[PDB]
Design a protein around this ligand. Structure first.
Ligand SMILES: *[C@@H]1O[C@H](CO)[C@@H](O[C@@H]2O[C@H](CO)[C@@H](O[C@@H]3O[C@H](CO)[C@@H](O)[C@H](O)[C@@H]3O)[C@H](O)[C@H]2NC(C)=O)[C@H](O)[C@H]1NC(C)=O
Ligand SMILES: *[C@@H]1O[C@H](CO)[C@@H](O[C@@H]2O[C@H](CO)[C@@H](O)[C@H](O)[C@H]2NC(C)=O)[C@H](O)[C@H]1NC(C)=O
Ligand SMILES: *[C@@H]1O[C@H](CO)[C@@H](O)[C@H](O)[C@H]1NC(C)=O
Ligand SMILES: *[C@@H]1O[C@H](CO)[C@@H](O)[C@H](O)[C@H]1NC(C)=O
Ligand SMILES: *[C@@H]1O[C@H](CO)[C@@H](O)[C@H](O)[C@H]1NC(C)=O
Ligand SMILES: *[C@@H]1O[C@H](CO)[C@@H](O)[C@H](O)[C@H]1NC(C)=O
Ligand SMILES: *[C@@H]1O[C@H](CO)[C@@H](O)[C@H](O)[C@H]1NC(C)=O
Lengths: 434, 120, 105, 124, 143, 120, 431, 428
């Protein structure tokens, strides 16, 4: 009369805790081995509504990244004893790197030892007006923790996996705009491999579009929303720190060693980064061609972002353990009209005291790496912001940079949603109970 | 495959009830609660199936008439022209009413089984 | 079930053996209780179950039969009989009350 | 002997919730069913609700089941009743009463009002 | 109003009643216990914002449910509130008139009266089910 | 005694199934994981028995004649002259695929109970 | 024949972990919502033995309270650089509040900064023979942790609830003396709302007795036991901290600030509590009548607790966020006979360094609250200790204050016990 | 016909997490009550394959002990204010060291005195008076809490439900291979987590004679575990009537050191019964010749005076003894004893990097009443062609102190679900 069916293939939207599979900090945290050849069950006749900007998988990824970084830094050397006056001189540009001396108590707590350390200008703030007395940029208002040299934060592919009772639905529409119905949807246990790459303007080592550049925005006419551009072909970006550094340790406690550059061999050089000019020009041409679909009959103008701290206006990234802040102005300085047809060297600065999550009263010190650093990354997407208050004219201005760190992960999680399985269904059959 | 019948008709999907039923059963506190929660969800359904006289069955026919205020489409369309997702959405507002009557029906059966037929 | 007052009125000038019946749509078994719904007062119980005299009930208040044909009567309605003869099916059919007969004397 | 007494709001608005209360006296609240019934003007009494005091095992007339509630506070030995969206047509003299619980050793049961309170006139 | 079984007394309401009368409220007790997880999940949905103590309480509640269900499953008692077996009652466990046990004692008094024999009785019940299980396959006229 | 029949023949050992069954269920993360794992194994086996038409049974004959290979011993060589440990070694292979046959057979039978087998 | 019954109304005494529900430390911990119109079932013809002095619900409440107090201080500022010599001058009786200056190293390790802070006399102990040289009390033998200004410890009603499979039995005998059989027993899933109020002599914001004053003691003859007096009517106690304080923040590390009082506006005035004299006089008369019933034909004399330690000879409480230590001598200084007929301003001190749970090597610093503090609490009970050795006289001596912290909560949990439900049982049947 | 059976008494060897029961660091950890006398089912007509050398119960015991020790020392005093120059004067095995230490009050420094052993003092200058606390240069020295006992007590390792522990009852079992007398328990015996490096104190005795077990007995570089059926009584005496004092270095955090030694200062010695030890070595060589036949057995030691490599290290309850093994293993076998020992307060039992523990002294005088129940010996390689077999004390690591007790246990996973043929039809 009324028949109960258990094992009904239905689900409802739900938020749960996801676990993480891999295959240092990521390998340790995402300790679950992955399953080769995931079942990837195709749903032959379903339509599922997605919304990449309300996806709680991004919120969980963000919280997991912050928690993992915090746990990784807890069992490490604190730099509180170094919040002292620094007597700094210049090396060699012409003042970018300083050789600073100070009086610090050593591991045996009865001897004051004069020590020398090498600091970058961005990490040093003047104290006095003599141009010699400096202090660490925020040591009086925050606790600076040295990253453990044995703990690697290098991004690796990770997979977010649903617990039993839940499933992840993946949109397999190659041109899906991140919101609305997807009519070609499959069910997976885990997401694809996602690299937790931290950057502020360009998306590095991400996924490429299958057929075309896809430009996504929560509301394209709302100037306050970040535009995420997913490229269909990567652009190679080759960043380097050519200075050959010899590292030394300064001991500041019973087993608490401060790491600094001991000496620089050869000449001091700028940590430039090279992007191919032809590939970037074609990339911008194709971005303009797709962007003009949302902004009809407008000139597309690329400009650098409004002035501010390097974390806001420069391209920030982790290259081999060093944090580079590159001047991207040469990449976003052009006017395109739509009637066109078809090396860039970016200077960069190195900053050792990093506050990646904008925490109050906390900062990380990245110890120097000796030798030279070279990275080759793939630019797979862009974060653009459209100027506000810009109307009544025939041109649009786009600037690099998005919102917070979530924008770097939505670009990978845009095709996934987590659903809860509801196996109990009821149908009005006519069978009697007995 | 798991949920492979999700886009199929309600009739065809009745042959995949064992596919989902097995899949449903399978740092630190953050993950330990998930395992405990998964068990509770499994048991939640089993307890509900235990309250109803449906224990041990995948398809359980009850003794509750369907002639109420419930939205009930012709069976030809429910089983051959509808999937379970749209079906469950169609009767969503009556889910709790249906469940309450099933429990009440079982309670009457229990009175017969436990209180009236006092045989041994 | 439901209860109804078969007698619209049960009035006499004095000392009559007034009686009323409590009819029902279905049997009330032993639950066909009676009460005296006196004017400007909450009703007094007249008889518990089908014929169990209420506490402190008058010796002259008789109750008889049961269920769908229950009855009650005064031995002699000597005084203060102007109270509606309410009854109820206090069983499966909630606690439905009858319209009550317009007893008087 | 039991000496129940009712109290109620002086007046209610039409199409608005109404409530009333009844204090018990000289009797156990438990092992009896608290109840309320009301008589409309020029009408026989209609049963409204009851609840076993020992466990708040409430029951109500089907006609009022969708817009009625009953509760009791054992600590205070007092019962209360309410109805949602009370209509003007609901005006009546509402009385509270104790219905004895005729429990047997056989687990048999029966209930009917026995101890009545003076009615509390009410209108919406 | 009129009927048999004092369901209206609520959970443990019949605890002070004799063993016979209280047997009409087994459903009341079972419903309170066999819905503990369903009800707890419903209570959890009222405050989604809600370490070791909580997990121990939840695991223990699950273990108690499963142990009772396993024990009834081992006995031929699954799905039943009242279950009888093939084990005769021993005069040593309790020597009393059956009428006085059912009408002159409550379940508290009874369980105290036979406490020292409860585990023994349970073992005998399990043994009888094993014999029945063999009978289901040893007697091939049922197959 | 618990597992005392391990060295006994399979026939005699079939009389202690409840002896073992009782014993299958019977820094704080370590103890909780031990308890959760024991619960998960119990439920895993109970679900497997209940997806099959074996719920509530200690001995369950299913709808499966023996297929090619699967066993290289007869009834007397297994039940009277072999122990369960020896039996597990004898059939250490052929431990899968049969489970899907049983699962599908049980689902087909439950569907048949509402369509054409001892119907309603 | 053995018949198995499941759903048997039988229970055994048991100890389990109860969860906390509520309708701030307590709002955060007791996150589980309570049920509307909670179910309570009266158990007819059930006699159950209770013992309020062996009730494990009290031990759990005590451990949970200490655990939350310890957890709430974990991320807060540890006041270790302030255990230095203080140059303190009187600020105003004039010496109750002192203006103390000290040389403290700031967040910059090579720069010494002179700072000023305001401390109460009870938190400052002289160290040298220089009348102006003092140090913080116990800072050399304990770690003083500042309470986080964003974390409120104000007590709210909480309910202790049994997990499924367990139930809480309650005694409904209005004059139950806390031990022995109770013949009016009901079963609940949750206790009533209990406020985790901390005090040393008077029980504030508790439950009142339903009928008359009930005096409970584990053994009245044994004078070493605490006597818990549950009142029939509450007595209102209105406490004031009249000084208008301005909070100041001193930075003592890289993101660690110490909070003190920078200035006081107006005059320095004494904190005090006002108790109605007539209500207290009636309360003591009623208490004496019940004590005379317990101690027949004897004179009852109330005296203040002996000793000089403000933690045990004064009425202390946390109200308004600050800890008051009030001199209750005016309340417990009387002689009553059996032939008796049918404002009190208590001076109070403020103490900022509180060893609230009598910990070894730990203390909390309560930061000052600016403005003025107003408090109105209900006195719902007393803790009395009887003097021993008075076996040859006709007068009994009672003093305020009990022998334990748990006694403040037994007075609320005395009517509850936790039992485990045993739904399965067997019986012989006519089969 | 296929019949499914549930509750089948079969199992597979498996590794799972074990919990711990006990009747102190082990107290409040091994929180489960122990069996009301052992609950053991003897399994007749069964054979079970054991392997003591790949038994994950030993690895879990190792990890559990390290974790317990690491947790136990966290809420204790960290001795970082003491890594200062010391002025030490000989009393020169034990020195009286004075130092200027800042106390709990940040404005005041006191000149404190403490007693340190030579093994805990590092010379730092050429004046023969300036010394520093050992390893404080690079590690954090944590003082053991004086209220927490590290005494080894019997503990029982227990399997979770669904698993069982099988025990081998073959009194002469070689440690590997088929065991013909097997029993089932839920918990292990009362194993003593004794920390030692050669002598295996306070262990279990052999049921029969002396049983000598090894993973191979021909490979070089492997431990030989000798289990005795007789105990050798040792009374290690530290006859120094110490009076202990505390130095307060933080806000209720104090350092505990010996304040004065009353009477004479004498080297601690272990008084080992001469007849029992000589008989023990005699019986050991008599059984050892069954494995190393037609060879002379001699003891020729390993290397020199390295306390953590060559010397015998063992605990006594806070006073850690480092004994010169050449007193006991120097004989030639064919056809009282006073063992000198040193005391070391700064130890690193599991060779952790950046951490060390300070063991507070025990006041009064002490006697370490202990039994030799076995030995961990390593054979000197390359002597197969000289007619004399050379053995030495030591070798291996801490795992060999537990393998010698857990050699008779294995954990198995129960597989209650079995499939067997029947005569019955389904009768659908
Ligand atoms: C709790 O205990 C009381 C007292 O034992 C129980 O009440 C008693 O119930 C019996 C029925 O089992 C009553 O007997 C009946 O009395 C009437 C009186 O007119 C008589 O007509 C019947 O034939 C029968 O004898 C008894 O009077 C009654 N006693 C009292 C004092 O009320 C009560 O039922 C028990 N409660 C539970 C929940 O078991
Ligand atoms: C959506 O349609 C595409 C084809 O347009 C399907 O793509 C195939 O997916 C399977 C997945 O196993 C691959 O093996 C094939 O190689 C893909 N084919 C091509 C031509 O690329 C896709 O699976 C469909 N998805 C859904 C969910 O229907
Ligand atoms: C996509 O990639 C192909 C690669 O050949 C390229 O030709 C095409 O222009 C790209 N599309 C866009 C929109 O950039
Ligand atoms: C970056 O390096 C790769 C080889 O690693 C090379 O293919 C690519 O052309 C380089 N990119 C630029 C912009 O020079
Ligand atoms: C999807 O729909 C088609 C008809 O449009 C049907 O043939 C097919 O079987 C359906 N898919 C599934 C999985 O049943
Ligand atoms: C310092 O400690 C001693 C005990 O060692 C104590 O007497 C003294 O009062 C303490 N100082 C302070 C300021 O509390
Ligand atoms: C305390 O304050 C309350 C506030 O309502 C007032 O009623 C009461 O009389 C006051 N009592 C005293 C003793 O000041």
């Amino acid at each position: 009369w009324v028949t109960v069916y258990y094992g009904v293939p239905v689900w409802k939207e739900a938020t749960t805790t996801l676990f993480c599979a891999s295959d240092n900090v990521w390998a340790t945290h995402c300790c679950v081995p992955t399953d080769p050849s995931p079942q990837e069950v195709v749903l032959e006749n379903v339509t599922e509504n997605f919304n990449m900007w309300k996806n709680n998988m991004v919120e969980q990824m963000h919280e997991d990244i912050i928690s993992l970084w915090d746990q990784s830094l807890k069992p490490c050397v604190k730099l509180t004893p170094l919040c002292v006056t620094l007597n700094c001189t210049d090396l060699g540009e012409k003042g970018e790197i300083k050789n600073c001396s100070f009086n610090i108590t050593t591991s045996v707590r009865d001897k004051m030892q004069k020590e020398y350390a090498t600091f970058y200008k961005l990490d040093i703030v003047p104290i006095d007006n003599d141009n010699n007395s400096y202090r660490l940029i925020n040591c009086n208002t925050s606790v600076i923790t040295q990253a453990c040299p044995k703990v690697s934060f290098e991004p690796i592919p990770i997979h977010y996996c649903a617990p039993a009772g839940f499933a992840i639905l993946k949109c397999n529409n190659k041109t899906f705009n991140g919101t609305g119905p997807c009519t070609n949807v499959s069910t997976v246990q885990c997401t694809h491999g996602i690299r937790p790459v931290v950057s502020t303007q360009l998306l590095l080592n991400g996924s490429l579009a299958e057929e075309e550049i896809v430009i996504r925005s929560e509301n394209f006419t709302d100037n306050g929303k970040t535009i995420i551009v997913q490229l269909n072909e990567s652009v190679e970006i080759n960043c380097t720190r050519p200075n050959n550094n010899t590292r030394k340790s300064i001991h500041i406690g019973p087993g608490r060693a401060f790491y600094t550059t001991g000496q620089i061999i050869g000449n001091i050089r700028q940590a430039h980064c090279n992007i191919s000019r032809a590939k970037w020009n074609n990339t911008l041409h194709k971005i303009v061609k797709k962007l003009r679909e949302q902004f009809r009959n407008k000139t597309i103008v690329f400009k650098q972002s409004s002035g501010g701290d390097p974390e806001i206006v420069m391209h920030s990234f982790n290259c081999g353990g060093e944090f580079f802040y590159c001047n991207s102005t040469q990449l976003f300085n052009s006017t395109w009209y739509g009637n066109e047809s078809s090396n860039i060297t970016l200077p960069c600065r190195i900053k050792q005291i990093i506050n990646l999550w904008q925490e109050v009263g906390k900062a990380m010190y990245a110890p120097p790496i000796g030798g030279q650093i070279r990275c080759s990354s793939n630019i797979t997407g862009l974060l653009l912001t459209r100027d506000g208050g810009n109307n009544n004219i025939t041109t649009e201005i786009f600037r690099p940079g998005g919102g917070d760190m979530r924008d770097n992960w939505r670009s990978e999680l845009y095709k996934y949603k987590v659903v809860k399985i509801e196996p109990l269904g009821v149908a009005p059959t006519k069978c009697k109970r007995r | 495959g798991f949920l492979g019948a999700a886009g199929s008709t309600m009739g065809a999907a009745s042959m995949t009830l064992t596919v989902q039923a097995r899949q449903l059963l399978s740092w630190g506190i953050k993950q330990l609660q998930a395992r405990v929660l998964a068990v509770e969800h499994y048991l939640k359904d089993q307890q509900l199936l235990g309250i109803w006289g449906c224990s041990g069955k995948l398809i359980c026919t009850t003794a509750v008439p369907w002639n109420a205020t419930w939205s009930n489409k012709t069976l030809d369309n429910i089983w051959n022209n509808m999937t379970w997702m749209e079906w469950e959405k169609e009767i969503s507002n009556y889910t709790n009413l249906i469940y309450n009557l099933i429990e009440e029906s079982q309670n009457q059966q229990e009175k017969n089984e436990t209180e009236n037929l006092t045989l041994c | 079930x439901x209860x109804x007052x078969x007698x619209x009125x049960x009035x006499x000038x004095x000392x009559x053996x007034x009686x009323x019946x409590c009819x029902x749509x279905x049997x009330x078994x032993x639950x066909x209780x009676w009460x005296x719904x006196x004017x400007x007062x909450x009703x007094x119980x007249x008889x518990x179950x089908x014929x169990x005299x209420x506490x402190x009930x008058x010796x002259x208040x008789x109750x008889x039969x049961x269920x769908x044909x229950x009855x009650x009567x005064x031995x002699x309605x000597x005084x203060x009989x102007x109270x509606x003869x309410x009854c109820x099916x206090x069983x499966x059919x909630x606690x439905x009350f009858x319209x009550x007969x317009x007893x008087x004397x």
